[PDB]
Specification:
The chain is built from 22 helices and 16 strands. By secondary structure, the protein is α/β, with parallel strands linked by helices. It has four domains: 193 residues, Rossmann fold; 181 residues, P-loop containing nucleotide triphosphate hydrolases (Rossmann fold), CATH 3.40.50.300; 102 residues, no CATH class; 102 residues, Double Stranded RNA Binding Domain. The chain has a seven-stranded parallel β-sheet with strand order 3-4-2-5-6-1-7. A six-stranded parallel β-sheet has the order 8-13-12-9-11-10, with helices on both faces. Strands 14-15-16 form a three-stranded antiparallel β-sheet, with helices on one face. Helix 1 crosses helix 2 and helix 20 packs across helix 21. The protein is globular. Bound molecules: adenosine-5'-diphosphate and magnesium ion (MG). The protein binds a RNA duplex through helix 5 and helix 20. It is classed as antiviral protein/rna. The entry lists the keywords RNA helicase, dsRBM, ANTIVIRAL PROTEIN-RNA complex.
Length: 652
RNA sequence: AUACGUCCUGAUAGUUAGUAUCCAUCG
RNA sequence: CGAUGGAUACUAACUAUCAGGACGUAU
């Protein structure tokens, strides 16, 4: 039954116009979400493909693609591979790319024609002298509105500025919302001018888009606001939260009265029980008890190695949680087979919304595909568990629900035994399952919120309020299919503030849509204007060799310290000490000092130059330490830590 | 009625310090 | 799990401007 579906792409007229304009000179493309900018980028890549066929040893060039997150790089690589005939490769941080030497990087450059990877990796390659910007043919900045202050985009731009104008590559950027944070309507012009100066380009908007052409293809859902109140609570729930409050009070009294071997341990206990209180308030007693038994398992793990006082505190906490369990036994909704009443009013409202949506779509032949957006990861995990349990209960109207979740990921040589784990392959598998149609619901954090082409959706639910203009715009634009719905859940007493914020957002959008028409080219004087480096970098082998920028000193120092062979449990870390002195002008002056662990050969402390701010003093001290360390003979030619073992140390 | 200096309040812009959360790199 | 970096929101202090209130001086 499967039929192949080639795109057989026929570009739309505004795409052709934008392609010509971008070919003429540097540009930034500003268009609404879902209007098809990735195909424009693909067309531009294909147009200039006659400069890539040459070998790399004889000065051949390559094309690069810059992306923020991992699902995005996978998806864009797949699209480019499908549409054109060139070879594409994808690089991320899972594979452990820093351990590679120069020869393997040269081989990788020789193998492919187009390279797609994250921005931080590109910065690392640029700094350590593996590649030079004179060999790049074209650069693409996905979501270019992130290049502000100290973001890695700005650092790469600083690298680009020094190069002579004879051999500078072309620049193209794609964005939908031009301003990152929230601001008054009077600062929009200043913000766009700053961005134009930073990226050394002018913004462009098609004349045909304003006339029908792109309105048909752009996505616009409907907005609905649903209100709930959390004051209305069950008396038993009030009793439980009062008991938890008095437990918090007595634990605080114990902390204030009883001395502690580690105050941070009881502070952690207090914050995790406050988290338990928050979980109860937001979700309900059953989810709280599930987290409580997970906590029970956590101290089952912990009791192998713990202190006596810490274990007594843990056991009195266990006693309190056990009393909570006996209180819940009287409220055994699952035993009573009526679990609808116990949940917090917010969860009840969400369930009512889902039921109404299913009732509406019962007549509709099309299936359902929805996304739920949550702020923190633990809430997402607990919500997924609860929804799966309700579906397994097999009641009247929850027999069709299938749920899964996606969050960020971590990796370590250690086991990291925990309830929540993630990996690149598992994340890709879940996304593929969602695309195919195995699951109908997805519970996600802000990882997938931006830029992901989602399967045709009908429903987006905001479990938490948007924080600024950009997040609101992107979350609105995530739904793609026709006749979509956008739903926001708001507490009763914050609805006026949310209303005024929505009005301000609409005004900002209206102003932005008009200001971008018929703009003027930027001036190179502003490009020469921006300069935040108070101290020049450290270049031992010349301008084109390796460098250690002021911003990257501390990370390199900590990497060297971590690579030092020592005990597994002990994680060595340099110690910092700040001394403040007042100058003749009575201005604030900061001088920092540094020390190293006794394992490293460098015994003597190192002192940096005085700086107006504490962070600047710390950076200066780190830079001086790095220069001295290289002078002594630790770091190798490429200015990265040497793979030195005990035998290597003995030989040297 | 106005200007100058002083004290208090609100907003705007910038700087500094603290708390919470998210995303990337490493062990 | 730990370590590092970047971004957002909240609070406090300082500086400058604006707005208002009060005081003294001069016009
Ligand atoms: N020429 C075209 N013909 C058919 N579909 C297209 C064309 N150009 C773009 N599209 C569709 O429009 C959607 C645009 O999404 P995408 O380009 O990934 O991000 P953006 O929302 O920034 O444009 C894609 O899913 C693609 O399938
Ligand atoms: Mg895109």
């Amino acid at each position: 039954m499967d039929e192949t579906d080639e795109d057989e792409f026929t570009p739309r007229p505004y795409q052709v116009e934008l392609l010509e304009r971008a070919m003429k000179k540097n540009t930034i493309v500003c268009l609404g979400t879902g209007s098809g900018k990735t195909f424009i980028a693909v067309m531009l890549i294909k147009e200039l493909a006659h400069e890539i066929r040459g070998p790399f040893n004889e000065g051949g060039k390559r094309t690069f693609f810059l992306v923020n997150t991992v699902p995005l790089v996978n998806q864009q690589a797949k699209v480019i591979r499908k549409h054109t005939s060139l070879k594409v490769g994808e690089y991320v941080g899972d594979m452990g790319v820093d351990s590679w030497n120069k020869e393997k990087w040269n081989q990788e450059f020789e193998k492919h024609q187009v390279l797609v990877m994250t921005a931080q990796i590109f910065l690392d390659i640029l700094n350590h002298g593996f590649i030079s910007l004179s060999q790049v043919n074209l650069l693409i900045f996905d979501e270019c509105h992130h290049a502000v202050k100290n973001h890695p985009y700005r650092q790469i731009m600083r690298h680009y500025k020094n190069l002579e104008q004879n051999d500078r590559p072309r620049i193209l950027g794609l964005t939908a919302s031009v301003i990152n944070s929230k601001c008054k309507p009077n600062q929009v012009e200043k913000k766009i001018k700053e961005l134009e100066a930073t990226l050394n380009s002018r913004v462009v908007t098609a004349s045909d888009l304003e006339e029908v052409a792109v309105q048909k293809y752009a996505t616009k859902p409907k907005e609905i606001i649903v209100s709930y109140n959390s004051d209305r609570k069950s008396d038993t729930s009030e009793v439980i939260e009062n008991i938890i409050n008095q437990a918090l009070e007595q634990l605080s009294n114990i902390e204030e009265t009883s001395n502690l071997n580690d105050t941070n341990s009881l502070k952690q206990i207090k914050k995790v029980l406050r988290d338990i209180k928050n979980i109860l308030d937001e979700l309900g007693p059953w989810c709280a008890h599930r987290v409580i038994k997970s906590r029970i398992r956590q101290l089952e793990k912990r009791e192998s190695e713990t202190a006596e006082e810490l274990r007594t505190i843990r056991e009195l906490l266990q006693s309190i949680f056990e009393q909570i369990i006996n209180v819940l036994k009287n409220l055994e909704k699952l035993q009573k087979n009526n679990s609808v009443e116990f949940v917090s009013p917010k969860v009840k409202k969400l369930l009512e919304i889902l039921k109404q949506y299913f009732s509406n779509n019962n007549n509709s032949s099309k299936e359902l595909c929805g996304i739920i957006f949550v702020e923190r990861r633990y809430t997402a995990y607990v919500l997924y568990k609860l929804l799966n349990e309700l579906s397994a209960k097999r009641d009247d109207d929850f027999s069709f629900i299938k749920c899964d979740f996606v969050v960020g990921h971590n990796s370590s040589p250690s086991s990291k035994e925990k309830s929540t784990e993630m990996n690149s392959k598992k994340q890709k598998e879940v996304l593929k399952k969602f695309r195919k149609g195995e699951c109908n619901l997805l519970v996600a954090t802000s990882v997938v919120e931006e830029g992901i082409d989602i399967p045709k959706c009908n429903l987006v639910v905001r479990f938490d309020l948007p924080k600024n203009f950009r997040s609101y715009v992107q979350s609105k634009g995530r739904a793609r299919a026709k006749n979509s719905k956008y739903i926001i859940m708001v507490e009763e007493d914050e609805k006026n503030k949310f209303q005024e914020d929505l009005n301000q957002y609409q005004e900002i959008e209206k102003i932005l849509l008009r200001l971008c028409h018929n703009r003027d080219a930027p001036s190179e004087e502003d490009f020469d204007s921006f300069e935040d480096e108070l101290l020049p970098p450290y270049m031992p082998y010349g301008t084109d060799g390796p460098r250690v920028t002021m911003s990257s000193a501390i990370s390199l120092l900590h990497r060297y310290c971590s690579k030092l062979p020592s005990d597994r449990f002990t994680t060595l870390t340099p110690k910092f000490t700040y001394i403040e002195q007042n100058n003749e002008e009575e201005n604030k002056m900061f001088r920092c000092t540094l020390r190293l662990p006794i394992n490293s050969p460098l015994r003597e402390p190192i002192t940096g130059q005085p700086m107006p701010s504490k962070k600047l003093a710390k950076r200066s001290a780190a830079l001086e330490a790095c220069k001295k360390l290289h002078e002594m003979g630790e770091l190798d030619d490429h200015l990265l830590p040497v793979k030195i073992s005990r035998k290597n140390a003995e030989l040297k």
